[PDB]
DNA sequence: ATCGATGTATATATCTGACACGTGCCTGGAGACTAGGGAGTAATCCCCTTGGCGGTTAAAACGCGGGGGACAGCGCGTACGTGCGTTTAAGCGGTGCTAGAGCTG
DNA sequence: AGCTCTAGCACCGCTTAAACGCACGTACGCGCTGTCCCCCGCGTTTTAACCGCCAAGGGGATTACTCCCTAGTCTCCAGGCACGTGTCAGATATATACATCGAT
């Protein structure tokens, strides 16, 4: 069988933010759990925001509200910008 | 035509397709929008980038080029804001801060 | 094989060292007793959820997945074991 | 009668208060914790098995609970103009969290 | 328009347990909110128990495990006892 | 044939059908078994009956024929197990339990 | 709709009101330094709740902070509130 | 010769009087002004339902009475009877709000 | 104030097993496609929030007195901590066993 | 239901540093006693919360319309994961320099 994770992706992100740093396998597991938990939180509040408004879709607005909800502070001012630029790229690429 | 992965179209290092499949199979809603997996992959990538940025800073302060979950604990906990997000989180082999109270110091 | 008691197995210098990891200077004589008590009741609470998680899946061993999942339900997520 | 060189009560405590907070090794011995986990899971049923990673996660989580509770206990103790901890400090730290 | 509520059901529960005692409107809404909150908690735990065992169908055993997790103490035993006698009555009456 | 409700088939007074519909619409799982609504309705009846019984006893202790939300707070806070269940739950118009610390009492 | 730019309303929660709120909790005497720390922590808690409430409103494209949004915002912080629909 | 009670008696009397009452201890209109002031810098020209305002009333009152009970426990642990700002900070920070 | 041992840290070399890299391979992301109803918009009615007025009056604010209660200081004394010596069981390794996970049907 | 086989469990020896008990001393808990200032309860005084009435009209809610958007199906291939190989950085060990704490 095969098991699905986020190890190579966090390795690529660490490589592009730091070209000369290594990382342990325990940290592979911790990043896997952290990415899974943050995804679970954001998707769960996306579902809750859908169910509160009688909404059958989860668009970028629900995820934007969820990112403004879970994360407080300046990351709330950061992660709603960066992801916005992401879809700003996507609408220029589709 | 030649297939291009949606993460590269979004300019992202995190998978759009895997996140979209997990949103479908997590059964959060009946329908999932087009830009929502892109946006969620972007916020996951930003959080991963910040946490590994602080991990690399803590590792360079420790002068140890491969990061340890100790360096991860110094990364998460010393940040004044990221500690609030991971407040109910125990990091395995993490430890605590080297803090000593001012009264507890010798006279 | 049924174990009689190993509450005393949690060593008194081990509680002293855990408290020193907590950042204390001096330890009272009763701390070794109520620390064992609170550790016992916390392990009771976690292990009950772990065993009923294992019983849900028709399984008769306890995995780290179920321990982490019980800790997640309890309100303290654990990263490092999936 | 001469006496050997020795430290004040508390300064080697601070030397290892710095030594024990810079390391990340597990503090409880592995076998007594495993035996305790096996004996707590007895009134639920007998003949239950634990993976080594399960016992590892249990020990890490319980040590995290004890270190957080001991920071709160030392903080309750220093609130009461005391440098050592007391049992009623432990029940205070449990009562403020609403889990007593 | 009409809004669904558990008002009359907990009202007849009150008439069954205290036949000479009425209810107030604020307490009625508090009990409705309690019913919704416990329903959401147990259904969410059952959803987690199904998802974590690679299971797609919520059976009576799902909610039995969920109520064994959530309700603490002797209420768990009376809850599983009443649930088991209810489902056996349901199967016997079918 | 004659229609006959599932609640009476289960000997149950919260509705089977409403719980089944909110289980399907709640997006908890793709499929819901037959025993799931009756079991969940039985659990809901047990909790509602217990709290209503304790509230009726508290109202008899206060001597009114009405459950005011103060009686609901007195019902759910005097029972240790219900206190552990509804620990992080605030009930409106409820107040607190009339407790005084024994250090504060002079004699 | 705001009639005027309101400011310095933290004194609206008066010292006698703080005294009752302490009395319900079961404390005998109150120091003079309590009455501003209590106002500060009250301000912090209300800011934390109302930020989530107004995000719930702006997701719904509304202008009115309804009771349901406040209920869900309080549920998000772990303090579930009953009596307002739920 | 007035009927001046001993300070430390009518305080407990009104402790018992308030602990049996469900009336709102914070007046409605100062809390209106405070809620509008807090919500002003998040979006200008916001409106509030009265039931939402009552939700703020009850949640705020419950949070404050729970915090004051915890600080009372922290004060009586510290061989004192009068609560102090250090009790406020200690209860909040053990609770984890800081 | 000064000097000394004890302790932690700094530096260089050897050594090793985890991690970095590569390769084969296949599930699942991607492109194309049609269809349906959810979604966005406009038109509409109208509950309901804001706003103002007036009087009532409960209550906030104010200053006063005085005495607990906070808190600094002191002394005493039990209970800590630190240490040496001894004891002991964890820790480590290999061996041997099969229950029981785990996958397929 | 059933085969495969990981790994949990049982054990046994020896090396091992902690675990253990005890001996000596002192800082620290606890209580007393001190001053005193801090707050509580008071009437007097004063502000505004409160009721309720009326009314303006924004804004949430419903109804209706039509259309872009996403599940769904189908085909296809490359990114992704298991597997394998081998450096190489961290652990280990020894020698060297500096500094906290003790007490001359």
Residue numbers in the entry:
A (entry chain h), E (entry chain d): 29 to 122
B (entry chain g), F (entry chain c): 12 to 118
C (entry chain b): 20 to 101
D (entry chain a): 35 to 134
G (entry chain f): 17 to 102
H (entry chain e): 37 to 134
Task: Give the published text.
Here we present cryo-EM structures of the yeast PIC bound to promoter DNA and the +1 nucleosome located at three different positions. The general transcription factor TFIIH engages with the incoming downstream nucleosome and its translocase subunit Ssl2 (XPB in human TFIIH) drives the rotation of the +1 nucleosome leading to partial detachment of nucleosomal DNA and intimate interactions between TFIIH and the nucleosome.
We then determined cryo-EM structures of the reconstituted PIC–nucleosome complex in the absence (complex A) or presence (complex B) of nucleoside triphosphates (NTPs) under the conditions of our transcription assay. Complex B was resolved at an overall resolution of 4.0 Å, with local resolutions of 3.4 Å for Pol II, 3.6 Å for the nucleosome and 3.9 Å for TFIIH. Comparison of the structures of complexes A and B shows that the +1 nucleosome is rotated by roughly 75° in the presence of NTPs. The transition from complex A to complex B also led to a further detachment of nucleosomal DNA from the histone octamer. In the absence of NTPs (complex A), only one turn of terminal nucleosomal DNA (SHL–7 to SHL–6) is detached from the histone octamer surface, whereas in the presence of NTPs (complex B), two turns of nucleosomal DNA are detached (SHL–7 to SHL–5). This Ssl2 wedge stabilizes the two detached turns of nucleosomal DNA.
